[PDB]
Amino acid sequence: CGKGYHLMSFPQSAPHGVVFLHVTYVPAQEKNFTTAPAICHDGKAHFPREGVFVSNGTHWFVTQRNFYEPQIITTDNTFVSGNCDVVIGIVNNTVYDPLQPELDS
Amino acid sequence: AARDLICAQKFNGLTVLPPLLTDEMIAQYTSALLAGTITSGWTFGAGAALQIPFAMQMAYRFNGIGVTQNVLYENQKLIANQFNSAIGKIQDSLSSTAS
Ligand SMILES: *[C@@H]1O[C@H](CO)[C@@H](O)[C@H](O)[C@H]1NC(C)=O
Numbered sequence A: 001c002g003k004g005y006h007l008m009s010f011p012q013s014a015p016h017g018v019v020f021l022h023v024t025y026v027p028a029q030e031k032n033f034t035t036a037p038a039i040c041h042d043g044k045a046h047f048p049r050e051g052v053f054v055s056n057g058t059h060w061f062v063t064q065r066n067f068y069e070p071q072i073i074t075t076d077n078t079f080v081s082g083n084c085d086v087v088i089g090i091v092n093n094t095v096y097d098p099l100q101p102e103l104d105s
Numbered sequence B: 001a002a003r004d005l006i007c008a009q010k011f012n013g014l015t016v017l018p019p020l021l022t023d024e025m026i027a028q029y030t031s032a033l034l035a036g037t038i039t040s041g042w043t044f045g046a047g048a049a050l051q052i053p054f055a056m057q058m059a060y061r062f063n064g065i066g067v068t069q070n071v072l073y074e075n076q077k078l079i080a081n082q083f084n085s086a087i088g089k090i091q092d093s094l095s096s097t098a099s
């Protein structure tokens, strides 16, 4: 259904045949980021639910794979599995808890 | 020595044309596909080659089949050993069996 990520197609009639118009999705403008497989916080390893960990050099974000939309690494877009002593390449950061400002107010 | 079969074939008007791509070009295309699918993943088949670490690519591959992606991150050495053993078994089976 064409080259790229397929979205829609439209048939057209031709003599002794058919013509398809495949609408696809092509990524355009790229950038370089530093990435990690997991985040170590409070003796625990955090893996993203959907997305990928990236860093611009100083701070760490989580964004979807096919588009650069960074956001804060919280407990609602990460899940905990085990400790930090097994995963190769795990880095140190902090994971935000949304219940902390609501409990303090 | 004796007359070959191919000389009797060519002397009666039956020739064989060479293919357009030599085997070096076939190996070059195969090497380009291998380098793309190792370095980038599936991103080079949909546009520009987007680099990614191979462990994270294989974590995406496990996420595609219904396994959570941490299972690779606690079994990475075992999975690499199993892949290397399977490649060696393919090499042994190709060196032994010819049918
Ligand atoms: C990323 O880094 C590589 C190596 O330094 C460089 O060749 C490339 O142009 C950079 N940018 C992108 C968008 O890949």
Ligand SMILES: *[C@@H]1O[C@H](CO)[C@@H](O)[C@H](O)[C@H]1NC(C)=O
Pocket (backbone or CB within 6 Å): A040, A091, A092
């Ligand atoms: C992450 O923090 C732990 C303890 O807080 C420390 O032992 C470890 O070395 C840190 N990681 C790095 C890469 O420095």
